[PDB]
Amino acid sequence: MKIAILSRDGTLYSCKRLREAAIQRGHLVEILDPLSCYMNINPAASSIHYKGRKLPHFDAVIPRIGTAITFYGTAALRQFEMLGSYPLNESVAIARARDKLRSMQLLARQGIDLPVTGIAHSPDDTSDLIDMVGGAPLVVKLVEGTQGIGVVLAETRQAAESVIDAFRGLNAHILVQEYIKEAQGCDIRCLVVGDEVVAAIERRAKEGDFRSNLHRGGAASVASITPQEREIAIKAARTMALDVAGVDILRANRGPLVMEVNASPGLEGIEKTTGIDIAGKMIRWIERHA
Amino acid sequence: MKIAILSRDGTLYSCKRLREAAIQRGHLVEILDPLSCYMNINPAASSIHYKGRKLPHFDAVIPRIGTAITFYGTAALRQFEMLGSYPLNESVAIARARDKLRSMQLLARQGIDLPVTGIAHSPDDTSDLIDMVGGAPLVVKLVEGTQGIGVVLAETRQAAESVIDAFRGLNAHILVQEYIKEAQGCDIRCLVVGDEVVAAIERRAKEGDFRSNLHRGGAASVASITPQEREIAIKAARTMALDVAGVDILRANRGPLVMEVNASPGLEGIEKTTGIDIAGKMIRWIERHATT
Amino acid sequence: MKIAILSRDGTLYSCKRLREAAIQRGHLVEILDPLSCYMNINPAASSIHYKGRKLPHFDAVIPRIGTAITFYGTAALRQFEMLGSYPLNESVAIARARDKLRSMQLLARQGIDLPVTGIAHSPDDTSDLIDMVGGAPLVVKLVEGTQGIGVVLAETRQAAESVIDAFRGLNAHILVQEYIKEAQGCDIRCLVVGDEVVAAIERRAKEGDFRSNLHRGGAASVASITPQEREIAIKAARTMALDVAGVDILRANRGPLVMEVNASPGLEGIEKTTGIDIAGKMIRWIERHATT
Amino acid sequence: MKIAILSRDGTLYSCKRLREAAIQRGHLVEILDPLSCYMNINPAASSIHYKGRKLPHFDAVIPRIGTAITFYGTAALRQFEMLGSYPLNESVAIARARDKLRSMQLLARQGIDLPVTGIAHSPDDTSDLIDMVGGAPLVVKLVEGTQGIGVVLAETRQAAESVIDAFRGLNAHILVQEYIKEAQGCDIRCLVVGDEVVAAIERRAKEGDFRSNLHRGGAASVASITPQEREIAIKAARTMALDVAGVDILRANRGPLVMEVNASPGLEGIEKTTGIDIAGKMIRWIERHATT
Ligand SMILES: Nc1ncnc2c1ncn2[C@@H]1O[C@H](COP(=O)(O)OP(=O)(O)NP(=O)(O)O)[C@@H](O)[C@H]1O
Ligand SMILES: Nc1ncnc2c1ncn2[C@@H]1O[C@H](COP(=O)(O)OP(=O)(O)NP(=O)(O)O)[C@@H](O)[C@H]1O
Ligand SMILES: Nc1ncnc2c1ncn2[C@@H]1O[C@H](COP(=O)(O)OP(=O)(O)NP(=O)(O)O)[C@@H](O)[C@H]1O
Ligand SMILES: Nc1ncnc2c1ncn2[C@@H]1O[C@H](COP(=O)(O)OP(=O)(O)NP(=O)(O)O)[C@@H](O)[C@H]1O
Ligand SMILES: [Mg+2]
Ligand SMILES: [Mg+2]
Ligand SMILES: [Mg+2]
Ligand SMILES: [Mg+2]
């Protein structure tokens, strides 16, 4: 089979592993920077050009589309889909998953448990919003945030007022979210391929922090996930219409809460922590559905 | 009926006209800034709060969501939808429609005639790209995400090459498009409501300009649209799953080409030029498809 | 005399009132959007063009530059200065005044009394920084370059810690400031023209806020200001090398403290609350210092 | 003496070389991240804290403040200055140098030869602007651009029209500049320390390109600088009151033209291309001008 990996990070571990795994299974592989594809849209069916050349047909495309290029990357992916390529994650679902508020609304509407989460942009009554979510302790987050930057624990009502008031000046969407204190700074990161969780690790915040992000000094280790946790990760991915998804879970008293769904999970940390061949399993899903 | 109009621009002509027409037909109307809505999304479909107060149920919501606020705006609209409010244009269709690339791809894929159009972001062979749409004169449209940056005519291959080179590295993608010179700065805006074109104007670009948008100096006149153009406007609107849309058509030598489908068309120019009660048609659509 | 008013807002009260007042006194006024000015900077001091024409010489220019467009704004003002125009606030002083950190560093170095104020960006010991100013309650001011993001009250040490933590990584710096509650949510906004306070007001935040800001629930009476307070306000304006300046003072047990110096103070609130012709005082100062 | 290097980039080549060179010459050195510095500004000239501790007095500070942090870095620098440290480049001069329009206006007004350079932001007559600068061929570039991104050669009038129209949608300051064809894509980068040029390199653009930037394929070699070019680089640095500066020069038919002045020139390319110990020369300047 002929497989395109659609990513700007072709030098990086996850793309190199997907290429190696596909070649090892006898497939032909090309790594394509989405930003280098250009194409006639009207007329439709028109072939994709790349560095002055006309790309061949690809049986499958593996999109690995950075947050910064979602709109154009999915446009390139959409073109491959119209030419008949099988996509490991559809353009429609990648664009939806990039929309964090929409994704959370969908998850909540389909029965998936999440922390009590309020959304706001320019709220004019800070106390009302704090009470609407249920009072301190609260985690305030910027929706378009990464690496734990703009994610803060407001333990008291006054901290929550001050943080929400300060974030107002930024003209940005925010989450105000119930603090899962009993998780003790740990989250469970599952990687879902198809109908199964293929791998899971635990990420643990440093002492003095509650954010498990690696960039914020988090530590990864092998996890023991429950049947319920497996089930919620698989159901979250299916609800998002993703064939491949990272799902981050917080362990609350009342059960697992889905915190995040990522359409382009990194392979390095979870593969190296667990020893599982995740890239191989992505390739096998492709073999079974293209 | 209780109708919310979702817009930051509650003072502007179109929001006032929608309010006026629904009030005249007996409906209770609130004009709500999406950015002032705050709400629990979990648990599902919790009430929407607004300036210290919890909002009542609305039977319908009219989204007039600004270009710079799609993500939050559509989330607010989606919350109304999960609360049971009927939307004049759904959140999903609105979000898709803001994506010009995705929309042109969908219209082309569904067989609607458009000008020859290539897309690019960081092309590494500009000559190949220009050749893709057949050379200058060309229109280049530059976009950051879904926000339009600008639309320029490039009269020579050199001009087009310079524009594309200029934007390399600026995180903007590029629509390169055949120039419909025979339009001589005129396009045809059809305003679709439900299954009808309810008004149609011809917009004529200023002197020394190809861009006929009234907000740049366009002169508007009433247009007489062929049944071909009328069926194309309605099919363009239905393909995008939009209940209200403005469909811009260029009259090329070979036939009518769709240029743009807009989920939130301005009402002022078209209402004044045609004297049609367009806001009223929108309220009627609501009356016919919303419950209670 | 021929007078240019440099502002994006030739629509709003202050600019119309400045043009009105200047015409009243026999001057020819033109309101010019700085962003519409274009010019050669080399050749040194070339003539400024504007919407297709070469502008005439202006004997004076009144800069009313918006926060958001300082770099081009001051550049255009600088060019007028080089062409010989008299500036009502020159570009060097305007540029320095937009930089709060630098400006307070100047005012304190020049011996004016301010609230205890600390600055930080990504401090690694937030309690050290809070103890630097004397603990909570604190005011925290978030700034991006020269553009204020917001001002908040931290009633506790925990709240202050959390605001600082919240902004780590956001590319904003932080002023931490002793909170003047004995000022009971009210500040004094004096308007300095040259050597005199032309008007002074007590501005009172709504019961429910500490920001005595006028865009946020303005209540304001005519003020009765100390001899020391007149001295201070004029001295603040002059240390900043500003000819026209709003000076906001906070009333403290310790004496009066300068809280802000604004090169481009609004006229509407202050003029109607005092009836004073402040624009007229500005035009007069031009008459007194613009040669011909 | 005790020397602080004020830089985010403590592990990068230039700061390591400065630290090495200062240590070799017997000084005590500390690399300090400006963003980790925090301090009272009122009261004036109190100690600078850093990761919980009070910093000792430094006899000299070497600022290496990135563009994105100009305003906070220079505030930190100013505080060291107020505490008596000698700065290798004063904060006020670094702050002005970050303002490219202001710096070009200053160099031009002081009689330093630059290319003819028009500035614009929202020009409303593209043709008038093009003619004001002198006509095609022109280089159009974003004022805030870096590495040559957003720098484009418009060889013809129509290319210039299209590029300028396209850039207008960015809401950004632009330069429209005489194109120095006879330079053949080479620029001379001089590094001035005090009253001399201590090193110079020629950067030559890749084939088919005119931009000599490293990231656009530029090739560095050792340069043969004329007495005239030496004098202009030193005078350009002196005019902007910088003690250390990179000065980029184009060789035009009429003479050398200053294209750029950088207060924080990188050391790696120029040192490795020439074999000159530049860091040591910066330390030597400090020894000659800083009291211990
Ligand atoms: N409600 C919460 N309760 C407890 N811990 C939380 C909560 N929200 C976030 N965290 C922790 O903070 C980390 C960062 O939050 P997260 O929402 O993942 O933002 P992000 O990583 O910066 N952006 P994204 O890539 O979209 O996840 C999580 O991985 C958790 O360890
Ligand atoms: N291919 C084309 N050929 C001829 N005229 C065109 C073409 N594309 C656009 N125009 C003209 O340019 C005008 C502006 O086009 P348009 O694509 O609608 O951009 P815009 O309204 O200025 N901003 P946006 O609608 O967000 O892209 C149109 O109304 C036409 O009059
Ligand atoms: N230390 C303080 N103690 C008491 N009140 C303060 C203090 N600092 C600021 N305020 C209040 O906050 C208001 C606004 O803060 P300010 O420092 O003026 O920030 P800003 O950039 O000017 N935003 P704004 O003034 O509202 O346009 C002032 O007018 C005061 O009423
Ligand atoms: N007017 C001009 N004539 C000829 N070549 C030019 C001209 N302007 C720029 N160049 C070339 O293009 C390169 C990039 O232009 P430049 O103005 O230096 O922008 P930049 O380096 O990407 N941003 P900056 O860090 O501020 O210098 C220069 O180094 C020259 O090689
Ligand atoms: Mg996360
Ligand atoms: Mg349009
Ligand atoms: Mg103020
Ligand atoms: Mg350069």
mmCIF file of all heavy atoms in Angstrom, chain A residues 196-226:
data_model
loop_
_atom_site.group_PDB
_atom_site.id
_atom_site.type_symbol
_atom_site.label_atom_id
_atom_site.label_comp_id
_atom_site.label_asym_id
_atom_site.label_seq_id
_atom_site.Cartn_x
_atom_site.Cartn_y
_atom_site.Cartn_z
ATOM 1 N N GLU A 196 -9.947 0.195 20.660
ATOM 2 C CA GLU A 196 -9.272 -0.239 21.876
ATOM 3 C C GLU A 196 -8.317 0.829 22.389
ATOM 4 O O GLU A 196 -7.819 1.663 21.624
ATOM 5 C CB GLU A 196 -8.526 -1.574 21.645
ATOM 6 C CG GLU A 196 -7.588 -1.545 20.432
ATOM 7 C CD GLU A 196 -6.685 -2.778 20.318
ATOM 8 O OE1 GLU A 196 -6.826 -3.689 21.154
ATOM 9 O OE2 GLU A 196 -5.838 -2.836 19.391
ATOM 10 N N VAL A 197 -8.081 0.804 23.704
ATOM 11 C CA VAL A 197 -6.933 1.496 24.271
ATOM 12 C C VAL A 197 -5.723 0.601 24.067
ATOM 13 O O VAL A 197 -5.676 -0.533 24.558
ATOM 14 C CB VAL A 197 -7.123 1.830 25.755
ATOM 15 C CG1 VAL A 197 -5.812 2.416 26.320
ATOM 16 C CG2 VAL A 197 -8.246 2.821 25.950
ATOM 17 N N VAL A 198 -4.742 1.117 23.345
ATOM 18 C CA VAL A 198 -3.546 0.374 22.984
ATOM 19 C C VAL A 198 -2.409 0.594 23.981
ATOM 20 O O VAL A 198 -1.486 -0.232 24.057
ATOM 21 C CB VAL A 198 -3.226 0.816 21.544
ATOM 22 C CG1 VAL A 198 -1.808 0.730 21.220
ATOM 23 C CG2 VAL A 198 -4.090 0.040 20.543
ATOM 24 N N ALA A 199 -2.473 1.658 24.778
ATOM 25 C CA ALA A 199 -1.395 2.035 25.679
ATOM 26 C C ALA A 199 -1.907 3.102 26.626
ATOM 27 O O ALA A 199 -2.740 3.934 26.252
ATOM 28 C CB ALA A 199 -0.170 2.556 24.919
ATOM 29 N N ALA A 200 -1.418 3.063 27.858
ATOM 30 C CA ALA A 200 -1.716 4.147 28.777
ATOM 31 C C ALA A 200 -0.524 4.378 29.702
ATOM 32 O O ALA A 200 0.176 3.435 30.091
ATOM 33 C CB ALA A 200 -2.978 3.852 29.582
ATOM 34 N N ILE A 201 -0.298 5.645 30.042
ATOM 35 C CA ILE A 201 0.704 6.034 31.015
ATOM 36 C C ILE A 201 0.046 6.963 32.014
ATOM 37 O O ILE A 201 -0.982 7.586 31.744
ATOM 38 C CB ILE A 201 1.924 6.737 30.377
ATOM 39 C CG1 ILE A 201 1.474 8.007 29.639
ATOM 40 C CG2 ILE A 201 2.669 5.788 29.484
ATOM 41 C CD1 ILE A 201 2.614 8.938 29.204
ATOM 42 N N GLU A 202 0.673 7.070 33.167
ATOM 43 C CA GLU A 202 0.327 8.070 34.159
ATOM 44 C C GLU A 202 1.344 9.204 34.084
ATOM 45 O O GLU A 202 2.553 8.957 33.998
ATOM 46 C CB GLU A 202 0.309 7.440 35.550
ATOM 47 C CG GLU A 202 -0.176 8.352 36.645
ATOM 48 C CD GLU A 202 -0.290 7.617 37.963
ATOM 49 O OE1 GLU A 202 0.395 6.575 38.127
ATOM 50 O OE2 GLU A 202 -1.088 8.070 38.819
ATOM 51 N N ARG A 203 0.855 10.439 34.082
ATOM 52 C CA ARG A 203 1.705 11.617 34.194
ATOM 53 C C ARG A 203 1.446 12.258 35.550
ATOM 54 O O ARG A 203 0.288 12.449 35.946
ATOM 55 C CB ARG A 203 1.458 12.620 33.061
ATOM 56 C CG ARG A 203 1.187 12.004 31.696
ATOM 57 C CD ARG A 203 1.829 12.783 30.529
ATOM 58 N NE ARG A 203 1.559 14.232 30.467
ATOM 59 C CZ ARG A 203 0.356 14.824 30.480
ATOM 60 N NH1 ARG A 203 -0.773 14.123 30.564
ATOM 61 N NH2 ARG A 203 0.280 16.145 30.407
ATOM 62 N N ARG A 204 2.526 12.582 36.253
ATOM 63 C CA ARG A 204 2.488 13.070 37.622
ATOM 64 C C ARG A 204 3.172 14.427 37.671
ATOM 65 O O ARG A 204 4.285 14.581 37.154
ATOM 66 C CB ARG A 204 3.177 12.071 38.555
ATOM 67 C CG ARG A 204 2.848 12.211 40.012
ATOM 68 C CD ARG A 204 3.324 10.981 40.777
ATOM 69 N NE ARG A 204 2.201 10.124 41.151
ATOM 70 C CZ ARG A 204 2.003 8.896 40.683
ATOM 71 N NH1 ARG A 204 2.856 8.360 39.808
ATOM 72 N NH2 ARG A 204 0.940 8.209 41.086
ATOM 73 N N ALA A 205 2.493 15.409 38.258
ATOM 74 C CA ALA A 205 3.057 16.741 38.436
ATOM 75 C C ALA A 205 4.213 16.723 39.441
ATOM 76 O O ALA A 205 4.305 15.834 40.301
ATOM 77 C CB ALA A 205 1.973 17.706 38.922
ATOM 78 N N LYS A 206 5.088 17.734 39.350
ATOM 79 C CA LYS A 206 6.129 17.874 40.367
ATOM 80 C C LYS A 206 5.495 18.194 41.715
ATOM 81 O O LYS A 206 4.340 18.629 41.807
ATOM 82 C CB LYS A 206 7.136 18.999 40.068
ATOM 83 C CG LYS A 206 7.430 19.344 38.624
ATOM 84 C CD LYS A 206 7.905 20.787 38.461
ATOM 85 C CE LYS A 206 6.679 21.646 37.982
ATOM 86 N NZ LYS A 206 6.819 23.167 37.974
ATOM 87 N N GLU A 207 6.279 18.003 42.776
ATOM 88 C CA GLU A 207 5.862 18.493 44.083
ATOM 89 C C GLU A 207 5.654 19.997 43.996
ATOM 90 O O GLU A 207 6.419 20.711 43.336
ATOM 91 C CB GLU A 207 6.895 18.143 45.162
ATOM 92 C CG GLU A 207 6.300 18.014 46.579
ATOM 93 C CD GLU A 207 5.366 16.807 46.738
ATOM 94 O OE1 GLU A 207 5.786 15.669 46.417
ATOM 95 O OE2 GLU A 207 4.209 16.991 47.185
ATOM 96 N N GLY A 208 4.568 20.466 44.604
ATOM 97 C CA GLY A 208 4.204 21.861 44.537
ATOM 98 C C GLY A 208 3.387 22.264 43.328
ATOM 99 O O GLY A 208 2.977 23.429 43.241
ATOM 100 N N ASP A 209 3.136 21.356 42.390
ATOM 101 C CA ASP A 209 2.325 21.679 41.225
ATOM 102 C C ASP A 209 1.189 20.672 41.104
ATOM 103 O O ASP A 209 1.153 19.651 41.794
ATOM 104 C CB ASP A 209 3.173 21.723 39.942
ATOM 105 C CG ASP A 209 2.557 22.610 38.848
ATOM 106 O OD1 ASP A 209 1.318 22.818 38.839
ATOM 107 O OD2 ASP A 209 3.324 23.105 37.996
ATOM 108 N N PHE A 210 0.230 21.002 40.234
ATOM 109 C CA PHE A 210 -0.920 20.156 39.951
ATOM 110 C C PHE A 210 -1.048 19.850 38.469
ATOM 111 O O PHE A 210 -1.965 19.116 38.076
ATOM 112 C CB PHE A 210 -2.211 20.823 40.447
ATOM 113 C CG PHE A 210 -2.655 21.995 39.599
ATOM 114 C CD1 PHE A 210 -3.684 21.848 38.672
ATOM 115 C CD2 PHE A 210 -2.030 23.236 39.719
ATOM 116 C CE1 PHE A 210 -4.094 22.922 37.888
ATOM 117 C CE2 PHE A 210 -2.430 24.315 38.939
ATOM 118 C CZ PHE A 210 -3.466 24.161 38.017
ATOM 119 N N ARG A 211 -0.171 20.405 37.639
ATOM 120 C CA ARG A 211 -0.220 20.234 36.194
ATOM 121 C C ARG A 211 0.776 19.155 35.787
ATOM 122 O O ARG A 211 1.976 19.255 36.076
ATOM 123 C CB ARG A 211 0.080 21.554 35.483
ATOM 124 C CG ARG A 211 -0.859 22.685 35.884
ATOM 125 C CD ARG A 211 -0.342 24.029 35.363
ATOM 126 N NE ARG A 211 0.801 24.465 36.155
ATOM 127 C CZ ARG A 211 1.640 25.444 35.815
ATOM 128 N NH1 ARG A 211 1.490 26.113 34.678
ATOM 129 N NH2 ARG A 211 2.641 25.753 36.629
ATOM 130 N N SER A 212 0.275 18.131 35.113
ATOM 131 C CA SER A 212 1.083 16.972 34.771
ATOM 132 C C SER A 212 1.876 17.156 33.475
ATOM 133 O O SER A 212 2.637 16.254 33.106
ATOM 134 C CB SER A 212 0.176 15.731 34.697
ATOM 135 O OG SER A 212 -0.836 15.903 33.709
ATOM 136 N N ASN A 213 1.740 18.303 32.793
ATOM 137 C CA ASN A 213 2.452 18.543 31.537
ATOM 138 C C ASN A 213 3.948 18.290 31.690
ATOM 139 O O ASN A 213 4.564 18.688 32.684
ATOM 140 C CB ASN A 213 2.241 19.983 31.053
ATOM 141 C CG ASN A 213 0.775 20.346 30.911
ATOM 142 O OD1 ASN A 213 0.084 20.566 31.907
ATOM 143 N ND2 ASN A 213 0.295 20.416 29.668
ATOM 144 N N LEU A 214 4.528 17.630 30.683
ATOM 145 C CA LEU A 214 5.968 17.383 30.667
ATOM 146 C C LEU A 214 6.745 18.691 30.804
ATOM 147 O O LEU A 214 7.644 18.809 31.648
ATOM 148 C CB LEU A 214 6.349 16.646 29.376
ATOM 149 C CG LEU A 214 7.818 16.452 28.955
ATOM 150 C CD1 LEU A 214 8.352 15.105 29.439
ATOM 151 C CD2 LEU A 214 8.007 16.622 27.435
ATOM 152 N N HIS A 215 6.377 19.697 29.994
ATOM 153 C CA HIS A 215 7.051 20.994 30.006
ATOM 154 C C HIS A 215 6.972 21.659 31.367
ATOM 155 O O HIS A 215 7.830 22.480 31.713
ATOM 156 C CB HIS A 215 6.437 21.913 28.951
ATOM 157 C CG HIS A 215 6.936 21.659 27.566
ATOM 158 N ND1 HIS A 215 7.332 20.409 27.137
ATOM 159 C CD2 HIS A 215 7.108 22.493 26.512
ATOM 160 C CE1 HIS A 215 7.728 20.485 25.878
ATOM 161 N NE2 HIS A 215 7.604 21.738 25.476
ATOM 162 N N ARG A 216 5.949 21.336 32.145
ATOM 163 C CA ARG A 216 5.893 21.763 33.529
ATOM 164 C C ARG A 216 6.502 20.733 34.465
ATOM 165 O O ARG A 216 6.083 20.633 35.622
ATOM 166 C CB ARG A 216 4.455 22.076 33.930
ATOM 167 C CG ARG A 216 3.778 23.084 33.026
ATOM 168 C CD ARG A 216 4.108 24.522 33.387
ATOM 169 N NE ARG A 216 5.435 24.980 32.965
ATOM 170 C CZ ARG A 216 5.802 25.205 31.702
ATOM 171 N NH1 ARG A 216 4.966 24.988 30.702
ATOM 172 N NH2 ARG A 216 7.027 25.643 31.435
ATOM 173 N N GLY A 217 7.496 19.985 33.999
ATOM 174 C CA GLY A 217 8.229 19.092 34.868
ATOM 175 C C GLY A 217 7.503 17.833 35.270
ATOM 176 O O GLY A 217 7.822 17.261 36.313
ATOM 177 N N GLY A 218 6.552 17.358 34.458
ATOM 178 C CA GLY A 218 5.851 16.138 34.798
ATOM 179 C C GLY A 218 6.671 14.887 34.525
ATOM 180 O O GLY A 218 7.578 14.873 33.693
ATOM 181 N N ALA A 219 6.335 13.820 35.249
ATOM 182 C CA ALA A 219 6.992 12.526 35.113
ATOM 183 C C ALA A 219 5.993 11.502 34.588
ATOM 184 O O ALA A 219 4.870 11.421 35.091
ATOM 185 C CB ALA A 219 7.561 12.056 36.454
ATOM 186 N N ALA A 220 6.412 10.702 33.610
ATOM 187 C CA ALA A 220 5.591 9.625 33.080
ATOM 188 C C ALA A 220 5.992 8.272 33.669
ATOM 189 O O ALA A 220 7.158 8.026 33.978
ATOM 190 C CB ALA A 220 5.687 9.583 31.552
ATOM 191 N N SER A 221 5.001 7.395 33.824
ATOM 192 C CA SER A 221 5.220 6.028 34.285
ATOM 193 C C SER A 221 4.112 5.131 33.734
ATOM 194 O O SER A 221 3.103 5.608 33.211
ATOM 195 C CB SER A 221 5.262 5.952 35.811
ATOM 196 O OG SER A 221 3.972 6.166 36.341
ATOM 197 N N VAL A 222 4.311 3.812 33.850
ATOM 198 C CA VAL A 222 3.328 2.881 33.303
ATOM 199 C C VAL A 222 2.102 2.886 34.205
ATOM 200 O O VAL A 222 2.214 2.980 35.432
ATOM 201 C CB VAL A 222 3.928 1.470 33.159
ATOM 202 C CG1 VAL A 222 2.834 0.433 32.970
ATOM 203 C CG2 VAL A 222 4.878 1.394 31.972
ATOM 204 N N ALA A 223 0.921 2.827 33.599
ATOM 205 C CA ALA A 223 -0.321 2.985 34.338
ATOM 206 C C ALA A 223 -1.073 1.662 34.409
ATOM 207 O O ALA A 223 -0.886 0.778 33.570
ATOM 208 C CB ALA A 223 -1.216 4.052 33.697
ATOM 209 N N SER A 224 -1.906 1.525 35.447
ATOM 210 C CA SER A 224 -2.881 0.440 35.559
ATOM 211 C C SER A 224 -4.269 1.042 35.345
ATOM 212 O O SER A 224 -4.860 1.597 36.276
ATOM 213 C CB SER A 224 -2.802 -0.252 36.919
ATOM 214 O OG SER A 224 -1.504 -0.740 37.147
ATOM 215 N N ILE A 225 -4.801 0.920 34.147
ATOM 216 C CA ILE A 225 -6.100 1.523 33.865
ATOM 217 C C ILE A 225 -7.210 0.515 34.123
ATOM 218 O O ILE A 225 -7.056 -0.684 33.877
ATOM 219 C CB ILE A 225 -6.169 2.068 32.430
ATOM 220 C CG1 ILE A 225 -5.909 0.976 31.410
ATOM 221 C CG2 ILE A 225 -5.191 3.202 32.246
ATOM 222 C CD1 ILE A 225 -6.001 1.515 30.005
ATOM 223 N N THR A 226 -8.337 1.011 34.621
ATOM 224 C CA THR A 226 -9.473 0.176 34.974
ATOM 225 C C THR A 226 -10.306 -0.151 33.736
ATOM 226 O O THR A 226 -10.188 0.512 32.698
ATOM 227 C CB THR A 226 -10.341 0.897 36.002
ATOM 228 O OG1 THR A 226 -10.954 2.036 35.384
ATOM 229 C CG2 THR A 226 -9.521 1.364 37.206
#
